[PDB]
RNA sequence: GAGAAAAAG
DNA sequence: CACAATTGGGTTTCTTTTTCTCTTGGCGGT
DNA sequence: ACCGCCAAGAGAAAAAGAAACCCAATTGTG
């Protein structure tokens, strides 16, 4: 029942505060009445017994156990652990504790099993062990088994003890990293962070000063008013808890009063002119209260100091001055050398969260008062509330909102307020991240972080991780920890140039927007009125779009300005496939050209003997002019454009401008500047290079299809077989479409003139690449039209010639050169179709050990067939991509290489790219050497055919699923000689 | 003019001098509410009905008149009938199903409630601009009506006198309608009071 | 049956009715024909002018129309109301959507008497597009005028009374360029409705 | 919650 | 009770992140 | 300088678009 859930939440969360005598009163009140005695026994009695056990009160547990005996339900082993805990922390009676042990040995409970099954507090567990040792030293279980190691064939070389292995070492000393850890601890305890804006502070005038003065004075006023209202309302609820139930006093005093007045003032500041819904502010306020509780519990519990000590012991592994006694993995040194304790608090249920949000919003309304109007005269001598809740219309449903008073909006607009408030999670780290010990363990220091990203609910994604074998998830967690330990900094000169273009109007073609001033901001005929309405609508939408781009640009470049001359570590999380995403959203390498160009490595390898050439290749790889030619011609092209490189690096914006026109202009500028700095040196090899170097994939999903069942045709078309000249399927398909279009133009169709040879690789990449997946022609026409929407040549589009040639006409030729891969596609589609008809969701295991499930359910909930037969291949082939990426990551880490990887685009320093390449080919050969298709067939049979629902669904699925397409006469071992696999 | 700004139907003042029975209802897309208050201070009834089968994606007229008849079965009979027209316009592309819902209910209910329309030849149901009936009060800012929950709480517990026969039930239901965001019944008493002030008892 | 009639009624009540009317309204005016279901039909007239379309949509002009149409209204045992499938998802054609729905609602309110007194929902809405298949008049996307088929009927499925047939033939010959009498096709679809009434 | 868009696979 | 073969209506390979407003705009003569 | 106010019609503008496609429902059947 819901009321039982709310009562359990109350009695659980009152332990996390110190209001135990307040907890006893409501328990006694509910036990006093027989109608209130129901739904009271459900797991709250051991909670309050543990509550009296943690405090220095051993006498009350006799009354607690008498109450449990009055309830008549059997005592829990947690209650026996609480009894052993209250025997602890106090002078032992030297008697009847063994009688209590005999009593708990009766009725089936075991003394040995409570250390492993109760999952009590570990300090209380040590106290219980101390009490037992005071009773008898006979029993002492050792939990320190040797650390379990994965036994998979692919991961065997990573975890092998033997062999010469070298690990990367960070540049900074140990003490500097400890000071950085201190700074991030202070930055995380206060969850908000204030960022100076990159908006120009323009024209401080007398009206501005008047607005600032009255705003500061009224701000002190409403801070005092909010504190007074919190005191009065908390006193009212403390009076209510004496004569009632569910009263919110422990929920409101969970935090201190200063943090909630700052939280309410911040949520008052964040409201736009049009206030959002009451439900939205309730959700935001209570979720922020929950995150605040998780942050601020560990100060008073004492885990922050223990985390600091364990971090001090662990940080010697990544420190330059200190030496670990034997080299080992970043996670395994955390697994040994002590272990921290994670509470893993379950969040309180939905009605408690919603209702606490409701009272916080109502408190903010009834407290916060603005005097009269904005004008200097004060003749009315009355104070009106600033925010009124308003019955409004929203978009489809009538939902009450919270609208601020317009004079407050006018005053808020009058003051500039250069401060920006960012969350603690969104801003990057200041210390190296917490290692991924377990899916429950997180990369952040004081805040939780889930392993796999979900939209809403979706518990089965983490349930498969929970039920996964303990050593199977070890490799993925190590790879995520590796991705966390990357050291970053922002460029000085690129940031300066981007900000200089930001302050002025700038150029919008680079990704830096303009201020809205440069944005557009008697009737003769009704047609003239219609034209005027149309151009007002166009002006309004364009102004809204430009303001929308400008706001995100300001919010990114402000954080970039804040994060100059410091070192940073981006933690990484997982999607449900296995593909990794950076947890800080605003500033990461999965961003734009500008955002990618700002980042460089904090630690710089020397260029080595090979060196500068590779950097130049990377420049051409982002220049975009030459993609279909070999590496020697790319180096020759980089040699020919050297004068433009020197001119662009010496004078980026004032002088001759070459880094325009490239597909990624600012990254081209960054590589340009790093190359020009590298050349101007006495020794090119001894120079320190901080620039990341890119390695991208040619057509990766088609390669992965070609491996799952080898081919001689198609596999050689995706550069798996070695070749001197790279072979791209997209250019061949584009050429075939163009030579059909030439004949259609000779025939005389009107659409052939409006295509006009504007077809390229980028036009058809999405559609030809989704041909190998299950594609509907609507999906083809939504991607072949968007590309021609960004091109500005021909105005009026009907794109069905390209789709009707691309999935119908060249689809004969697509069947001609892609034979066997479509058999794999039909096999997977039919398997998923019969699984959907059986009623299950498809689960598959990656070769590394990550289990993947699909969150496609109909509106307990039936699977949706349409988004499950389709979207099964581009949900498994990406899992194979991620398994290959993590294998490349681990074998890159073993050779002393620093490795950060965009998915299907790896990054490494200039010297280290050849070793990372050989790692990549070795992992590709290793991953597909194990037969993925037959193991997948066996797992699909074991999961989706082991129950006899009916004879037809068993028989047809067995007959279709036992068949695997036959691989061809092509050797996977050639990939080690493949030069243009990932280049 | 001014009374024409308030009232959309045109009723001359002599009948409005003594009406002796007024019912005020407020349409809502999820829930319905009504209250009877005379030209004198007396409040007769206050009820709301919930759990419509409607706005479920299918628009059908039969269940429309089934729901309107189920509402009218509890309604009493009075001299003039108060309606609250929305502030929405047909030109607004957004909120169109809500506007169609409001227009269809106002048509169905204005079509009913008048058994003797062909006999008297005079209109009986009158509607209100919500902005103007707020404008008798002070509740607007930026041409938008606020809740009036605090105002109706101050008026309930003079601007309006609630009879003591049902005031206990009014308070008991008011605690629930104050815990939840139920704004429809709160505007009914306010628009009734402004009807009895601005066009009546001048 | 269920596809042809969105509401449902007893089959014996559907088959045997003393007299019905054709409640079918256009954009400009409404026309009602008195069908006695014995294939002998009594009276057909139409509204002279609609005053509600002038100005804005407001309840007063709607009521002033509906009192006049229901005042000219003859008593019938059963009543058939048309049902148009104007899609709500279409962003255009909003004013005619409100026009047709509100006119349908107030026809379904004023004409349908004794709903509170007698539990039978009395007037039912007819699927026009499914009846268009029984017409076999076009492909189905659009419906042509039924003036040709009633002209083929008279001037014998109509069977006007002898005193009424000459005056109705004279009135039909007098009115041929109004271009709003397309509802004449609906005046025989009730005859098509008698295919359900047998 | 829906919309106007934008950038990565 | 137990089916049941044919006939329309929501959806169109997949996965991340981000910003903003929920028609207001125009007219008015004090 | 500031609320006041206000009426937002009925115009053809038909704008994208259709083209598969599959998965569940319904009067008929034993
Ligand atoms: N819209 C998409 N839908 C499905 N998969 C996608 C999509 N975009 C990218 N991918 C996946 O990304 C991978 C390859 O895409 P990507 O854009 O990186 O091409 P590429 O191999 O780098 O091509 P190129 O080097 O020729 O530009 C594949 O695994 C493919 O499935
Ligand atoms: Mg790639």
How would you write C142-192 as a 3-class SS string?
CCCCCHHHHHHHCCCCCCCCHHHHHHHHHHHHHCCCCCCHHHHCHHHHHHH
Q: For the domain that residue B96 is a member of, what is the CATH number?
A: 3.30.420.10
Work out if A576's Cβ lies within 7 angstroms of strand E. Answer: yes
Please tell me which residue in A613, A696, A867, A958 is annotated as part of the active site. Answer: A696
Using alpha carbons, select from A811, A816, A845 the residue that is nearest to residue A937: A845
- Whether residues C109 and B106 touch (CB distance < 8 A) is answered with no
Distance B96 CA to E10 C1' (A): 22
User: Cα–Cα–Cα angle for A313, A315, A319, nearest 5°?
Assistant: 130
Burial of B26 (0-12, 13-18, 19+ CB in 10 A): buried
**What resolution (Å)?**
3.8
Query: What does the alpha-carbon distance between residue B194 and residue B192 come to, in Å, rounded to a whole number?
Result: 5
Q: Is the dihedral of CA A140, A143, A146, A152 positive or negative?
A: positive
A276 sits within 7 Å of strand D by its CB: yes
The residues, any chain, with a CB within 8 Å of residue B179's CB and separated by 6 or more, are none
* HEC sequence for C99-152: HHHHHHHHHHHHCCCCCCCCCCCCEEEEEHHHHHHHHCCCCCCCCCCCHHHHHH
Longest dimension (CA), chain C: 50
- What is the SS3 assignment for chain B? CHHHHHECCCCCHHHHHCCCCEEEEECCCCCEEEEEECCCCCEEEEEEECCCCCCCCCCCHHHHHHHHHHHHCCCCCCCEEEEEECCCCCCCCCCHHHHHHHHHHHHHHHHCCCCCHHHHCCCCEEEEEHHHHHHCCCCEECCEECCCHHHHHHHHCCCCCCCCCCHHHHHHHHHHHHHCCCCHHHHHHHHHHHHHHHCCCC
How many Å apart are CA A641 and CA A761, to the nearest integer?
24
CA of B183 to C1' of E25 (A): 30
3-state DSSP call for residue C22? strand
Cα(A276)–Cα(A955) distance, rounded to whole angstroms? 55
CA C54 vs. chain centroid, Å, equals 23
Say if residue A636 is exposed, middle or buried (CB neighbours under 10 Å; 0-12, 13-18, 19+).
Answer: middle
CA distance A817 to C70: 74
Q: Does C115 sit within 8 Å of B69, measured CB to CB? A: yes
Residue B143 backbone zone (phi > 0: left; psi -120 to 50: alpha; other: beta): left
From the CA of A545, how many Å to the C1' of E20? 8
Q: Is ligand 1 within 6 A of the CB of residue A475?
A: no
Q: What whole-number distance in Å separates Cα of residue A376 and Cα of residue A291?
A: 41
Q: Contact, C30 vs C17, CB < 8 A?
A: no
How far apart CA A699 and CA A739 sit, in angstroms, is 23
| Residue of the CA atom closest to atom 8 of ligand 1 | A766
Nearest neighbour of B147 by CB, restricted to A391, A393, A405:
A391
Identify the residue whose Cα has the smallest distance to the C1' of F18. Answer: A778
CA of residue A591 to ligand 2 center, whole Å:
16
Question: Exposed, middle or buried, A400 (CB in 10 Å: 0-12/13-18/19+)?
Answer: buried
**Is the CB of A731 within 6 Å of ligand 1?**
no
What pairs with residue B7 in β-bridges? Answer: B128
- Tokens standing for C151? 């002209």
Chain pair B-C, CB pairs under 8 angstroms? 80
Ligand nearest to the CA of A760: 1
**CA–CA dist B157, B162 (Å, integer):** 9
Whether residue A904 lies in the annotated active site: yes
Strands B125-129 and B80-85: parallel
Question: Left (φ > 0), alpha (ψ -120 to 50) or beta: where does B142 sit?
Answer: left
Check: CB of residue B44 under 8 Å from CB of residue B90.
Answer: no
Smallest CA-to-CA distance from A296 within A170, A412, A424 is with: A424
Gap from A449 CA to E18 C1', Å: 20
* Interchain proximity A390–B95, CB inside 8 Å: no
State both tokens at A522.
Answer: 């008697």
d(CA A655, CA A496): 16
Q: Which residues have C-beta within 8 Å of that of residue A366, sequence separation ≥ 6? A: A229, A385
The alpha carbon of A885 and the centre of ligand 2 are apart by a number of angstroms equal to: 12
Which residue CA neighbors atom 1 of ligand 1 most closely?
A766
For A201, phi then psi, to 5°, come to: -70, 105
For domain A605-689, the CATH class is: mainly alpha
- Flag whether A touches C (3+ CB pairs, 8 A cutoff): no
Q: Which of A670, A593, A661, A597 is nearest to A625 (CA)?
A: A661
Residue with nearest Cα to nucleotide F2 C1'? A375
The answer to whether strand E lies under 7 Å from the CB of residue A874 is yes
Of the residues A12, A358, A626, A765, only one is catalytic, namely: A765
Q: Does C112 touch chain B (CB under 8 A)?
A: yes
Lookup: tokens for A485: 């330990």
What is the DSSP-derived secondary structure letter of residue A676?
H
Tokens (6 digits) for C17: 């009715």
Minimum-distance residue to F10 (CA–C1'): C95
d(CA C134, CA C157): 15
How many Å apart are CA A975 and CA A924, to the nearest integer? 8
Number of domains in chain C: 1
Phi first, then psi: what are they for B147, rounded to 5°?
-70, -45
CB atoms within 10 A of CB A564: 12
Q: What are phi and psi of A852, to 5 degrees?
A: -120, 135
Q: Under the phi-then-psi rule, with left for phi > 0, alpha for psi from -120 to 50, and beta for the rest, what region is A400?
A: beta
CA–CA min distance A402, chain B (Å): 9
Q: Are A579 and A483 in contact (CB under 8 A)?
A: no
Give the nearest ligand 1 atom to A699 CA: 21
Q: Which residue is nearest to nucleotide F17 (CA to C1')?
A: A798
Shortest distance between the Cα of B148 and any Cα of chain C, in A, equals 27
Structure tokens at A510: 């680079």
Cβ within 8 Å of residue C56, ≥6 positions away: none
- Which nucleotide shows the minimum CA-to-C1' distance to residue A774? E13
Q: Give, as ranges, the nucleotides of chain E with any atom within 7 Å of a protein CB.
A: 11-27
Distance (Å) from CA A700 to ligand 1 centroid: 7
B183 vs A contacts (CB less than 8 Å): 391, 400
Chains A and B contact (Cβ–Cβ under 8 Å for 3 or more pairs): yes
Distance A234 CA to E20 C1' (A): 37
Our answer on whether the CB atom of A871 is closer than 6 Å to any ligand 1 atom is no
Closest residue in B to A398 (Cα–Cα): B29
- From chain B, the residues in CB contact with A278 under 8 A are 181
- What range does the domain containing C180 cover? 11-197
Looking only at the bridges linking them, the beta strands covering A488-490 and A599-601 are: antiparallel
CA gap B15, B34 in Å, rounded: 23
Nearest-atom index, ligand 1, CA of A766 = 1
Question: Could you tell me which chains touch chain C, where touching means 3 or more CB pairs under 8 A?
Answer: B
Separation between the CA of A789 and the C1’ of F24 (whole angstroms): 38
Is residue A881 lining ligand 1, measured as CB closer than 6 Å? yes
Contacts of A236 (CB under 8 A, 6+ apart): none
Residue of C nearest to B83 (CA): C59
- Give contacts of B 16-75 with C, CB under 8 A: 59-62, 64-66, 69, 72-73
Q: Measured over all CA atoms, what is the biggest interatomic distance in chain B, rounded to whole angstroms?
A: 46
Query: In this structure, what token pair is assigned to residue C43?
Result: 């009276």
A394 touches strand E (CB under 7 A): yes
Chain B nearest CA to C93, separation (Å): 12
């Amino acid at each position: 029942s819901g009321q039982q859930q709310r009562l359990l939440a109350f009695f659980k969360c009152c332990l996390l505060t110190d209001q135990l005598p307040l907890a006893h009163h409501l328990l006694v009140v509910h036990h006093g009445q027989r109608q209130k005695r129901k739904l009271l026994t459900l797991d709250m009695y051991n909670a309050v017994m543990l509550g009296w056990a943690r405090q220095g009160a051993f006498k009350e547990l006799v009354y607690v156990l008498f109450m449990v005996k009055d309830a008549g339900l059997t005592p829990d082993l947690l209650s026996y652990a609480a009894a052993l805990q209250c025997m602890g922390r106090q002078d032992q009676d030297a008697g009847t504790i063994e009688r209590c042990l005999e009593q708990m040995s009766q009725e089936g409970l075991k003394l040995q099993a409570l250390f492993t099954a109760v999952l009590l507090s570990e300090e209380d567990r040590a106290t219980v062990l101390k009490a037992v040792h005071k009773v008898k030293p006979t029993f002492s279980l050792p939990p320190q088994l040797p650390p379990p190691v994965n036994t998979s064939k692919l991961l065997r070389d990573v975890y092998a003890k033997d062999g010469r292995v070298s690990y990367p070492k960070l540049h900074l000393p140990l003490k500097t990293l400890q000071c950085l850890f201190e700074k991030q601890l202070h930055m995380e305890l206060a969850s908000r962070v204030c960022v100076v804006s990159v908006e120009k502070p323009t024209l401080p005038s007398k009206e501005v000063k008047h607005a600032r003065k009255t705003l500061k004075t009224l701000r002190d006023q409403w801070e005092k008013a909010l504190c007074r209202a919190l005191r009065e309302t908390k006193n009212r609820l403390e009076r209510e808890v004496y004569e009632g139930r569910f009263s919110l006093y422990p929920f409101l005093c969970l935090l201190d009063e200063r943090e909630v007045v700052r939280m309410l003032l911040q949520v008052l500041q964040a409201l736009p002119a049009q206030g959002e819904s009451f439900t939205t502010l309730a959700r935001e306020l209570s979720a922020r209260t929950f995150s605040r509780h998780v942050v601020q519990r560990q100060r008073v519990s004492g885990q922050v100091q223990a985390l600091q000590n364990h971090y001090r012991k662990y940080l010697c592994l990544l420190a330059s001055d200190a030496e670990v006694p034997e080299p080992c993995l970043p996670r395994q040194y955390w697994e040994e050398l002590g272990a921290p304790e994670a509470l893993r608090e379950q969040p309180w249920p939905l009605p408690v969260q919603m209702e606490l949000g409701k009272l916080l919003a109502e408190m903010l309304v009834q407290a916060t008062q603005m005097p009269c109007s904005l004008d200097k005269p004060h003749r009315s001598s009355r104070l009106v509330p600033v925010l009124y809740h308003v019955y409004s219309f929203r978009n489809v449903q009538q939902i009450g909102i919270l609208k601020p008073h317009p004079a407050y909006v006018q005053l808020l607009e009058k003051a500039a307020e250069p401060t920006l408030t960012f969350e603690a999670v969104d801003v990057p780290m200041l210390c190296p991240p917490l290692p991924w010990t377990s899916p429950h363990s997180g990369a952040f220091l004081l805040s939780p972080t889930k392993l796999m990203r979900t939209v809403e609910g979706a518990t089965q994604h983490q349930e498969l991780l929970e039920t996964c074998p303990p050593t199977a998830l070890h490799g993925a967690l190590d790879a995520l920890t590796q991705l966390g330990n990357c050291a970053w900094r922002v460029n000085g000169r690129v940031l300066d140039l981007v900000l200089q273009l930001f302050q002025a109007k700038g150029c919008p073609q680079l990704g830096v927007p303009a201020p809205p001033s440069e944005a557009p901001q008697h009737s003769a005929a009704p047609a003239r009125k219609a034209e005027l309405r149309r151009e007002l609508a166009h002006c309004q939408k364009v102004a809204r779009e430009m303001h929308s781009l400008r706001a995100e640009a300001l919010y990114r470049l402000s954080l970039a300005q804040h994060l100059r001359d410091r070192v940073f570590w981006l933690p990484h999380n997982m999607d449900f496939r296995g593909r990794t995403y950076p947890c800080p959203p605003h500033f990461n390498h999965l961003g734009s050209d500008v955002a990618r160009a700002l980042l460089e490595f904090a630690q710089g390898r020397p260029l080595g003997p090979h060196g500068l050439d590779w950097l130049k290749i990377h420049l051409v790889n982002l220049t975009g002019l030459k993609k279909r030619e070999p590496l020697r011609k790319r180096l020759a092209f980089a040699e020919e454009v050297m004068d433009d490189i020197l001119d662009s690096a010496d004078q980026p914006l004032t002088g001759r401008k070459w880094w325009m026109g490239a597909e990624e202009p600012w990254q081209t500028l960054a590589c340009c500047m790093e190359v020009a700095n590298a050349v101007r040196a006495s020794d090119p090899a001894a120079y320190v290079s901080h620039l990341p170097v890119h390695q991208d994939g040619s057509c990766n999903g088609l390669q992965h299809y070609a491996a799952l069942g080898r081919d001689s045709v198609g596999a050689a078309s995706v550069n798996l077989e070695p070749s001197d000249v790279p072979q791209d399927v997209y250019s061949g398909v584009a050429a075939q479409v163009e030579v059909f279009r030439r004949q259609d133009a000779q025939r005389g169709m009107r659409v052939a003139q409006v295509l006009e040879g504007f077809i390229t690789r980028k036009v058809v990449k999405q559609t030809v690449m989704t041909v190998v997946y299950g594609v509907t022609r609507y999906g083809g026409r939504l991607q072949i039209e968007k590309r021609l929407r960004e091109l500005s040549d021909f105005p009026q589009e009907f794109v069905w010639e390209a789709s009707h040639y691309l999935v119908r006409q060249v689809f004969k030729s697509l069947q001609e050169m892609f034979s066997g891969t479509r058999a794999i596609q039909h096999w997977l589609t039919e398997s998923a179709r019969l699984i959907s008809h059986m009623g299950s969701v498809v689960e598959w295991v990656t070769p590394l050990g990550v289990p993947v499930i699909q969150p496609y359910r109909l509106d307990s909930r039936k699977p949706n067939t349409r988004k499950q037969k389709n979207g099964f291949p581009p949900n498994f082939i990406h899992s194979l991509d991620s398994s290959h990426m993590m294998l490349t990551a681990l074998h890159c880490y073993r050779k002393g290489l620093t490795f950060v990887s965009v998915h299907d685009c790896y990054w490494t320093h200039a010297a280290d790219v050849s070793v990372m390449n050989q790692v990549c080919r070795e992992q590709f050969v290793r991953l597909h050497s194990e037969p993925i298709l037959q193991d997948l067939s066996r797992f699909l049979v074991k999961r989706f055919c082991s129950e006899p629902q009916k004879i037809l669904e068993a028989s047809q699925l067995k007959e279709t699923l036992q068949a695997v397409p036959k691989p061809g006469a092509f050797d996977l071992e050639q990939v080690k000689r493949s030069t243009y696999f990932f280049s | 003019r001014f009374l024409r700004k308030l009232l959309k139907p045109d009723i001359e003042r002599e009948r409005l001098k003594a009406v002796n029975s007024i019912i005020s209802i407020v349409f809502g897309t999820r829930r319905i509410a009504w209250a009877h208050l005379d030209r004198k201070l007396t409040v007769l009834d206050w009820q709301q009905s919930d759990r419509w089968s409607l706005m479920r994606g299918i628009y059908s007229s039969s269940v429309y008149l089934e729901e309107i008849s189920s509402i009218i079965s509890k309604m009493p009979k009075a001299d003039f009938y108060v309606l609250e027209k929305t502030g929405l316009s047909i030109q607004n592309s957004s909120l169109f199903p809500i506007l169609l819902h409001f227009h269809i209910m106002e048509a169905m209910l204005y079509a009913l409630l008048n058994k003797t329309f062909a006999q008297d030849g005079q209109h009986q149901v009158l509607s209100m601009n919500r902005n103007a009936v707020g404008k008798h009060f002070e509740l607007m800012i930026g041409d938008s009506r606020t809740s009036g929950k605090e105002l109706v709480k101050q008026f309930l517990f003079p601007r309006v006198f609630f009879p003591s026969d049902k005031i206990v039930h009014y308070r008991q239901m008011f605690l629930s309608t104050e815990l939840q965001r139920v704004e429809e019944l709160y505007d009914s008493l306010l628009q009734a009071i402004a009807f009895y002030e601005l066009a009546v008892f001048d």
